[PDB]
Amino acid sequence: SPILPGAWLGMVGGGQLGRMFCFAAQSMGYRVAVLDPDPASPAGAVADRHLRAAYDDEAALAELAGLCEAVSTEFENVPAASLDFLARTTFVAPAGRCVAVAQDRIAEKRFIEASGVPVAPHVVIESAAALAALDDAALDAVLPGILKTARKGQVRVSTAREARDAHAALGGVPCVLEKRLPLKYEVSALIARGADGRSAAFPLAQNVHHNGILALTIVPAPAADTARVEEAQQAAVRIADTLGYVGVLCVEFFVLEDGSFVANEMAPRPHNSGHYTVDACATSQFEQQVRAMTRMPLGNPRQHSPAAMLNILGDVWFPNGAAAGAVTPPWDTVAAMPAAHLHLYGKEEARVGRKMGHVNFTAEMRDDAVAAATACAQLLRVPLD
Amino acid sequence: VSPILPGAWLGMVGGGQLGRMFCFAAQSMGYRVAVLDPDPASPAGAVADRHLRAAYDDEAALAELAGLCEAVSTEFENVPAASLDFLARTTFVAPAGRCVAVAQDRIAEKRFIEASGVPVAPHVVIESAAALAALDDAALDAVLPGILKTARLGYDGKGQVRVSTAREARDAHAALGGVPCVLEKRLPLKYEVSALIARGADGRSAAFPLAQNVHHNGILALTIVPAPAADTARVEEAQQAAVRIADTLGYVGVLCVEFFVLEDGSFVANEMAPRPHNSGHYTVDACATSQFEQQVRAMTRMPLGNPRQHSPAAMLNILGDVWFPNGAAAGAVTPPWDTVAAMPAAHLHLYGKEEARVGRKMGHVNFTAEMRDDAVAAATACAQLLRVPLD
Numbered sequence A: 001s002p003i004l005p006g007a008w009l010g011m012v013g014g015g016q017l018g019r020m021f022c023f024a025a026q027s028m029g030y031r032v033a034v035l036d037p038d039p040a041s042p043a044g045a046v047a048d049r050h051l052r053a054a055y056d057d058e059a060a061l062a063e064l065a066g067l068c069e070a071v072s073t074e075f076e077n078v079p080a081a082s083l084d085f086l087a088r089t090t091f092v093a094p095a096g097r098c099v100a101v102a103q104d105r106i107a108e109k110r111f112i113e114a115s116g117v118p119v120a121p122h123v124v125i126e127s128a129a130a131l132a133a134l135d136d137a138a139l140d141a142v143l144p145g146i147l148k149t150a151r152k153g154q155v156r157v158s159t160a161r162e163a164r165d166a167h168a169a170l171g172g173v174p175c176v177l178e179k180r181l182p183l184k185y186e187v188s189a190l191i192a193r194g195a196d197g198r199s200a201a202f203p204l205a206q207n208v209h210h211n212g213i214l215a216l217t218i219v220p221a222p223a224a225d226t227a228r229v230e231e232a233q234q235a236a237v238r239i240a241d242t243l244g245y246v247g248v249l250c251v252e253f254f255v256l257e258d259g260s261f262v263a264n265e266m267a268p269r270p271h272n273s274g275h276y277t278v279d280a281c282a283t284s285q286f287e288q289q290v291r292a293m294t295r296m297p298l299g300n301p302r303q304h305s306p307a308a309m310l311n312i313l314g315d316v317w318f319p320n321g322a323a324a325g326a327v328t329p330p331w332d333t334v335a336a337m338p339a340a341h342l343h344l345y346g347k348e349e350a351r352v353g354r355k356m357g358h359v360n361f362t363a364e365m366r367d368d369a370v371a372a373a374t375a376c377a378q379l380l381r382v383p384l385d
Numbered sequence B: 001v002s003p004i005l006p007g008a009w010l011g012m013v014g015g016g017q018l019g020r021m022f023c024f025a026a027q028s029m030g031y032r033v034a035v036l037d038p039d040p041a042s043p044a045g046a047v048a049d050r051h052l053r054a055a056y057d058d059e060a061a062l063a064e065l066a067g068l069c070e071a072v073s074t075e076f077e078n079v080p081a082a083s084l085d086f087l088a089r090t091t092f093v094a095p096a097g098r099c100v101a102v103a104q105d106r107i108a109e110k111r112f113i114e115a116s117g118v119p120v121a122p123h124v125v126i127e128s129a130a131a132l133a134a135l136d137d138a139a140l141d142a143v144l145p146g147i148l149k150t151a152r153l154g155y156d157g158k159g160q161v162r163v164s165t166a167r168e169a170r171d172a173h174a175a176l177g178g179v180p181c182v183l184e185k186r187l188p189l190k191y192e193v194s195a196l197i198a199r200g201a202d203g204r205s206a207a208f209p210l211a212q213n214v215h216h217n218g219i220l221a222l223t224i225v226p227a228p229a230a231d232t233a234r235v236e237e238a239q240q241a242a243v244r245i246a247d248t249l250g251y252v253g254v255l256c257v258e259f260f261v262l263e264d265g266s267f268v269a270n271e272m273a274p275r276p277h278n279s280g281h282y283t284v285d286a287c288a289t290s291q292f293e294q295q296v297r298a299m300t301r302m303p304l305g306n307p308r309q310h311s312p313a314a315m316l317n318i319l320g321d322v323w324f325p326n327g328a329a330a331g332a333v334t335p336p337w338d339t340v341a342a343m344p345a346a347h348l349h350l351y352g353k354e355e356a357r358v359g360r361k362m363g364h365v366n367f368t369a370e371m372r373d374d375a376v377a378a379a380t381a382c383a384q385l386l387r388v389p390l391d
Helices: A016-027 A043-045 A057-065 A082-085 A095-102 A106-114 A128-132 A136-140 A161-169 A226-243 A285-293 A331-335 A366-380 B017-028 B043-047 B059-068 B081-087 B097-104 B106-115 B129-133 B137-141 B166-175 B232-249 B289-297 B336-342 B370-386
Strands: A008-012 A032-035 A048-049 A072-073 A121-127 A145-147 A154-157 A175-179 A181-195 A199-201 A205-210 A214-221 A247-256 A260-266 A307-313 A342-344 A355-364 B011-012 B034-036 B050-052 B073-074 B123-126 B148-151 B162-163 B179-185 B191-201 B205-207 B212-215 B219-225 B253-261 B267-273 B313-319 B346-350 B361-368
Touching: A008 A016, A008 A082, A016 A043, A016 A285, A016 B017, A032 A057, A048 A057, A057 A082, A072 A082, A072 A285, A082 A095, A095 A285, A106 A121, A106 A175, A106 A226, A106 A260, A121 A128, A128 A161, A128 A175, A128 B106, A136 A161, A145 A161, A181 A226, A181 A285, A199 A226, A205 B011, A214 A247, A214 A355, A226 A247, A226 A260, A226 B129, A247 B137, A285 B148, A285 B179, A285 B289, A307 A366, A342 B011, A355 A366, B011 B017, B011 B059, B011 B081, B011 B106, B011 B179, B017 B034, B017 B043, B017 B289, B034 B043, B034 B059, B043 B050, B043 B212, B050 B059, B059 B081, B073 B081, B073 B289, B081 B097, B097 B106, B097 B267, B106 B179, B106 B232, B106 B267, B137 B166, B148 B166, B191 B289, B205 B232, B219 B370, B232 B253, B232 B267, B253 B289, B336 B346, B336 B370, B361 B370
Parallel strands: A008 A032, A008 A072, A032 A048, B011 B034, B011 B073, B034 B050
Antiparallel strands: A121 A175, A145 A154, A145 A175, A181 A199, A181 A205, A181 A247, A205 A214, A214 A307, A247 A260, A307 A355, A342 A355, B123 B179, B148 B162, B148 B179, B191 B205, B191 B212, B191 B253, B212 B219, B219 B313, B253 B267, B313 B361, B346 B361
16 A cells, blocks of 8 residues: 655665655655765765664664655665565565675576566676586686676676686676677666656667766667667566566666667666656656556656756866866756756765766757767766767 | 855745745755744744844844855745845845845835836725825825725735725724825736746846736735736736836835736835745746746846746645634635646645644745646636635
8 A cells, every 4th residue: 555745754865866756755745855875975965864874883773763654765785684584564665685696796687587587698707616517718708807796796708718717806706798889889677656656757868988988868769669669668678577576677778789789787766767757757767656656646657848958967067177176066057957957965075976966958940969978978068888 | 346155154034935945945055044933833943054033123133144154045924124224234135135125015016116107906995084184085086996005014805994985084094093095996807927036146137937826815825827818018018117116216126016907907105015925836837947946046046047938837736724624613624635746737835834724825836838728727626625715
């Protein structure tokens, strides 16, 4: 049965995702308690209540579970044991078991395959013993590639020898060895699924990464035709159904030069590639998180306006280099752009690589949203390639 | 003159639903908000970066707000202009006290709009018993039947008397103690509209579309945007009238001007609100920039946002009455918010107020759709579900 407006909802993690959840939840009349050990928590600052405590502090967890009728998550490395502890006393969506699958590169690959969705070529290496039982030819099948720890932790490798040495260099921990592929473009599907098994899919997003960090998202994905959108949406839903997932799920895919389509990873939460939904869709990804965790009907995902999203890293504050000190970006100039919606997360210190905000661009025509995002990237010195 | 950029502290005098929705807009852009509101259960204070839980005339609280904030705006209906001018000693106050004061006095408001060259709804000003004694019956008959309204402090229907004859008008004035009043003629109304504009310190403005408003029992019930009854010329006329008033006032902020369109086609202004307005809540879900974002931009001397309406919209108000389907005395019943949330057009906004009371604004539901008729049909169905009369 539904948990109606006025109820306390809990959020494990108080970064920008938790912060944007607060606005969605409070707008609908819910109260939000954020658990985040950071005294400067961006989400905690704007929540109804902030429990300043560690993610494994049982007294804090009991207080959250006691106060809240449902709890969801945004923090990247949340211990599933904490979600377990919480679910003894309250409704937790997504469940710890789902979060644990999504947080482990081996589990996630195995699960997507089990859901009947093609996965990007890789070899699983659980241990030194598992590595010993793989011959050079077995490794060569996925090389050159990148060795990645299943749970920073990545090594580019070209030969079987480099692969063996890299595994030892990472301490022999569980890893996946991912083949480098002839990538054409990247897309993400973003879906909400409820406790009753009903789901709602957003449009397909096309994502550009720079130096391994999301830079630009365009929606609807320019490169993907109707059949591709449908294929990607159905894939994400199939995964969510197989997982018994309640919440927002983001699945990232590669489209290769040969036209093939492969899933690479998934996030058990609202995702950076979904921030456009706040300004471009009838229901945002944050509103869907609220609806899923309260067992309320899912919202209409209708995209009213074509959109682009430009990430704002801390690098934007360092036009004279990181060491020379912060310079406030020209936010007035950005606000003068008619397509722009400026989102800044209330983080105190700009640092290289740190996500400080984003700018959504909406317009009647997609080309105009994209041109505005491109011009803003030039203004702010944000590299797109 | 310079812009007040993201990260700055912004103050809000008043912590009801308007201040709450202001907080979401301001915090999303990276500003920190301090709310001044004496109510310990302040809906805005609950979600603000800071809540100064203080009376509106508490000078210690006001000095702390002004010291902390680089700019301060207002939402509270009866804010003393003396408090705004106290604040303006040490911070940027937008809109200014003198603008707010004009809107709070029915006589000043009518006089100011006329002085701005915008036609005003027929009325007679009655400053005093002596002024009334010097008006002949024919002078009163010109605006009768009508409603006698106190000039000051008559919020939410207070200080008003329906009158039909000159004698009833004179008796009503004496009943109210002879205080300053306006006598407003009851007009042959065809429809009501509101214009909603933002104006900056640099004199630039940005106008939303024209909203058509339906009132019942003296309270806003339903808003539809764009106004179905207004053609392009009417939209432009109303927007330009609101900008003319704002320019004449030297107004910095969001201004809502409410008008009547009469059976004969006459277009007259009746009142203005020096703040975001209930008839503007649709902007949060229907426009590229909401009225609350424009309040942030205006008070920070930042460029105004694009007011583009991406989707046709309707808004249904939710009063505390919705909780009392068996009567006010019979006790509260939680409304079917799940059934509302199932409506694909609906956007549910509930304000976090603790006690449902008759006549109290507890929330609103915005409806957006590709087609206006569908948004209107959804609002009308939701009104039937919730037992909300629209006429």
